[PDB]
Structures are given as structure tokens and as C-alpha cells.
């Protein structure tokens, strides 16, 4: 993928439960897999800010519940490092549901997003209210 523009310490693994920062009707997402990732023996697959992941809906509306969808990680509690040396961290871990074309399934994003996630997913960004 296109360089992210910052170094990331993945703060999530397969199985982690995160916030769905949108209005798709999904409230909580479970990480199932990480796009393009391949680990090593015994290593739990990890995902962090900027990765595209496959998720299952754990909490939300009946129609959304249990659906296996694609998403993009927009916030994480574990710090990331920007070119100027500063570390950046969020209040929670969150992702936004996305389609085949990486366009947000929802109409609105909830909460801030990392600028780096913009470079990658512009259409996701063109839905963000706050970009930090």
C-alpha cells in the first residue's frame, strides 16, 4: 500500500473488539483478519492504524449483527510515530466499515480520524468531521 506517512505499533489483534465509528448501524466490531498480512508461527495476527481489516459485527442493529464486512482502522490507543518524532495516540480503538472500493458504507463518521488514514482512504476522509 501507499506509504502511511508514520510508523505504527499495531495495537490490535485478531479477535479484538473495537468501536465502529460510523452510522452504519454497527456499534462494536470484532477483528477477524488483516488485509495483506502474513505472520509467523504462534503469532496472533496484528492490525493497527491505517490497515484494512475484515470484521464481524458483534453489537449493533439486527440486520448488521453477525455480518462479515471490511473496515479501516481509524483510531487506536497504542501510540504511532510521526516524521517529526512526536507520538500520537487516541482515546479508543475504532474502525469504519468500507466496501469493495474502500468507500465508507455509512453516511457519517463519528469522532476524530488520523490524518495518515486520509492519504490512504480519501473517500473515507471526505466523510470525516475531525482529522488530527
Amino acid at each position: 500500500m501507499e506509504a502511511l506517512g508514520a510508523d505504527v505499533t499495531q495495537g490490535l489483534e485478531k479477535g479484538s473488539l473495537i468501536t465502529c465509528a460510523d452510522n452504519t448501524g454497527a456499534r462494536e466490531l470484532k477483528v477477524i483478519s488483516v488485509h495483506g498480512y502474513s505472520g509467523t508461527k504462534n503469532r496472533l495476527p496484528k492490525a493497527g492504524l491505517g490497515d484494512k481489516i475484515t470484521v464481524s459485527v458483534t453489537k449493533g442493529t439486527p440486520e448488521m449483527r453477525r455480518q462479515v464486512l471490511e473496515a479501516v482502522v481509524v483510531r487506536q490507543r497504542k501510540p504511532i510515530r510521526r516524521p517529526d518524532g512526536t507520538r500520537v495516540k487516541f482515546e479508543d480503538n475504532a474502525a469504519v466499515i468500507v466496501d469493495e472500493n474502500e468507500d465508507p458504507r455509512g453516511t457519517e463518521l463519528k469522532g476524530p480520524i488520523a490524518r495518515e488514514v486520509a492519504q490512504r482512504f480519501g473517500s473515507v476522509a471526505s466523510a470525516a468531521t475531525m482529522i488530527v
Binding site: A3, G5, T40, K41, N42, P83, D84, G85
Partner: protein
Amino acid sequence: PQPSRPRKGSLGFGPRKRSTSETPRFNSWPSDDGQPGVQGFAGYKAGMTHVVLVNDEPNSPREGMEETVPVTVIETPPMRAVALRAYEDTPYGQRPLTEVWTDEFHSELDRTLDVPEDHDPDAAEEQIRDAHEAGDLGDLRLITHTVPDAVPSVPKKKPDVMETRVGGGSVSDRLDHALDIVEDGGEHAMNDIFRAGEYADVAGVTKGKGTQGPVKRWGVQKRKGKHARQGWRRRIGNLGPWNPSRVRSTVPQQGQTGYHQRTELNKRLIDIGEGDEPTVDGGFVNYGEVDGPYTLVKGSVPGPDKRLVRFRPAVRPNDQPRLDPEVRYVSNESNQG
């Protein structure tokens, strides 16, 4: 089904024993290209700090922007090429033929060797030039040594001696180039060889850790879950199969870890100066203060503070040189805190 997995640790840096010479010894040298010139230099590690640099990379989306970069401060005072050794090619490889020494010696070079009192530089030179006429001359190298005394933070006064190859134009020309340096007094500096922005390979003897177990030394797993409470926590599963009925040298075991020579490739020289611009408030921890000739190396360098590190023009650079990077800031914030 027993999943695959690469083995633990590299088999390419063995045996993992205590280094024989604390002074690093390059086992390779740059190729002959430019004008004749000494292919290396040395200094003493002081510590680290960081600097803000203007992205120099012409292919980076950030070209021309502020960028914080880690730097290891190495004190690199002038050294003294004290002699010119000549190697001759033989059926059994390269062998020392003779050496051409000088008269002017640093006041304390006698703390390491028996300094010459009676030597014939012309007889030696004569034998060398005849070797060249015959076409039996191998490469040409300079016996070099440091001046620890010039570095206050380093307690040693005894000079560290190393042989550094001289490459360059034609042999005849670099032979003459070698002799010129030596004759003077051999005194040369970091500037004379490197330029800020070029890539250097740094060699040094890593920090010693004495005896350590397989987990730390080779990176094998610790025993997991229930297997961690029965009496075995940091011991590998087994030393090998029933057959072969012997333990292979490839199974990870305890032993000396650290204090090994390492040659780290493509280290970018961020800046070569002199003074106290890089020094840190309160002084570098366990080292002291810097106020003299110094070199800022991008990233990390093997070895503890005070150890002798060696520089050599990168023999396998991946990127082209982007000379004299613009340094907008050099942290002097205390390293204690």
C-alpha cells in the same frame, strides 16, 4: 501438523565467542575508483542525541520537510598514519613485504609498541618500487593509530593501532600518495576521507553481556502456559533427535553473548564538525563532555560508550550520496531524565 518456522538466530555470526581484538578489523575494503586515498578512519563512541533534518531524499513525498533523526555522537580526532606497509602477491595469497616508517611519533605511541630508533625508509621504499616493477605488488596499506589523549572522556592514553588500506588511482600514484602522508607525520582527519552525507560502514565490538541463556542469546521461546511451571522456564525442548546420536552445533545453547565484532553497513554520516554543538546537558551519561572533532552517525553504532569504532567508505551502498544534509536542530537536552 507442526507448522514451519525459521530457526532461532543466525548461523552467520559464529562461533558466538569473545572477540580477540577489541579494536575492530575490517575484512574487506572499498573498490579502487576515485583519486588515491586512505579508505578508513576511527573514533570513540560518546553517546546519542537527535537532530532535526530537512528531508534530502529526492524521491520522498516529504522532500524538503522537517524530520527528526536519531544520531550517535562519535569523537573523531586526528589520527596518524605512521607507516606504509606493502603486500606482495604470492602463490599462497598476500603477504607483508616491507614497511616504510617515519621519525615523528606521538609522545605516547610507546605505550603500545617499541618505536623504531633505527630505520631505512629509502631501502624499504626501494624494495617496494622494485616489487612494483616486477608486478608482484599487492594492495598498499597504512599502519594507523589513534590519539586517545585528545579525547578527555576516554581514560586510555595507550593508542589503538590498525592497518587501513589505501585505494585510488593507479598503484604508482597511490603508492606516492601513501608515502607523502606517512612522511609528514601521518596526521590526517575525518574530513580528509569522508564528507557529510556519504555512507560509511561502521565496525565495532558489541557491548558485552557475559553468559546468557538461549532465550536472550538466540531468541528461542520461553516455555509456555503449563510448560512454564513444572521446573523448566527458559530451557529449550530438546538438544536434538535420537539420531544423529550427538548434539549439533546448530542447536541454540547458552554461552558468551556480546563483545563480538560487528560491521554495520550503510550508516549515513549526518555531519562532521568540531566543538561542542552535539554535547548534551549534564554530559553524556557514563562518558563525559564533547568539545573537539566529532562525527554524527545516523542511528546506532555497535559498542558501549568509549569503545573504538572504525569507519570505512560503504562497500555496498544502496543509495546515492546526498551531500551535506541541512541540520536545523541538534538536541542538547540532558540525557538524564
